[PDB]
Design a protein around this ligand. Structure first.
Ligand SMILES: O=S(=O)(c1ccc(O)cc1)c1ccc(O)cc1
Ligand SMILES: O=S(=O)(c1ccc(O)cc1)c1ccc(O)cc1
Ligand code: NA
Ligand code: NA
Lengths: 116, 115, 115, 116
């Protein structure tokens, strides 16, 4: 599990449950190719998106579908989604945790990068 | 004025209006002494808290009454207030902007220090 | 101007100066079309991006070139850039301020929408 | 473990290690009485501050010694510390996670509150 996503809800003070996440990887023709997807669990975490073999060097985009999350709770938010774009594994394999904190008109995102 | 406070509301995407703000200065006996206070304007800003003459080096605390703000909007908050504690240091001319972004169970605060 | 961008630096406690910002509008064929761009000023702000005539309802993306900013300061960043994607909706007069607070491995963004 | 503290470093993209944390509780005379203290581990987490029996109703202050953290890394930060003040257990026992994200001139704090 070299890529994990955590999401928290700043209005409720709780994990953000059932948040859809789509990961893309930039292809040779400079388009975003679908790479992996999933949803956050009751703990707000999304595990098992990829494997060490599959998660090669590249530029990755982690799209967090924040609008669908808020609308399912009856709230009209500002952003369409949160996009996190980064180069991965350029100095060898690393483990990446993408963390996000959500409010209807604001969000924060952090990266925790560790070396196995 | 060398000290200004700005407060934003992350739930409504708006300035945080009519928020009470209290500034304290640390006295020699280690207690917090009232220094200045006010309420944020329609733009979420509080100007005119102090003057360069009065804002000497020392430790200051800015207390933002976030609980009352959320209660007035019918929203149940977590924190009693937001506290920002910092040292004022002289080191050339200095303007201090204390910014805060409020959510019911979260807040962020930033210091913008400019010449 | 109905759209403004503000960028702050959380490491130095200062405006983020000379940061490139690109705005795109979603076209009918689902691609991102260049719409406006500029560089943040000494106050970290980018004004005059568009006009009320041109800023019609639709989906917009604001791209902040954070990687170049940190590299110019000798700091190694994580993100390629910061992207802010939102729908502009009419619903009375509307000013949009897109604010961003930058750290090397983190960023926050807020929308302040005022009448 | 009804009270836990997590701290992340936004400059390094890593847990904030060896951050001192002091917890206080408002006493009957309206002073802050020392309640518990500890330091974050290599994971950035501080466990074992208190017990269900000890952690009664009250107003609590969690002081995170951010200045000492940055100065130990050779950085001159803005804030003296981060203070998180809240009423706890007013509707019965809850579990509280205080999370913080640190930059030299900025910090964010969130609360995750769950019911056992
Ligand atoms: O979800 S968090 O608590 C988190 C904790 C440890 C990690 O390695 C990653 C995320 C969190 C994330 C961001 C934030 O601003 C506050 C808490
Ligand atoms: O740039 S800010 O100070 C700002 C203040 C008032 C506004 O109406 C708009 C922007 C700012 C930016 C980010 C943040 O988290 C807090 C304050
Ligand atoms: Na290489
Ligand atoms: Na009660």
């Amino acid at each position: 599990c070299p890529l994990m996503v955590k999401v928290l809800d700043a209005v409720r003070g709780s994990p953000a449950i059932n948040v859809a996440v789509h990961v893309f990887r930039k292809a040779a023709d400079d388009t975003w190719e679908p790479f992996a997807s999933g949803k956050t669990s009751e703990s707000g975490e999304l595990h098992g998106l990829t494997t060490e073999e599959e998660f090669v060097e590249g530029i990755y985009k982690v799209e967090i579908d924040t609008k669908s999350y808020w609308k399912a709770l009856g709230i009209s938010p500002f952003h369409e989604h949160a996009e996190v774009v980064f180069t991965a594994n350029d100095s060898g394999p690393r483990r990446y945790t993408i963390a996000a904190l959500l409010s209807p008109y604001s969000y924060s995102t952090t990266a925790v990068v560790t070396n196995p």
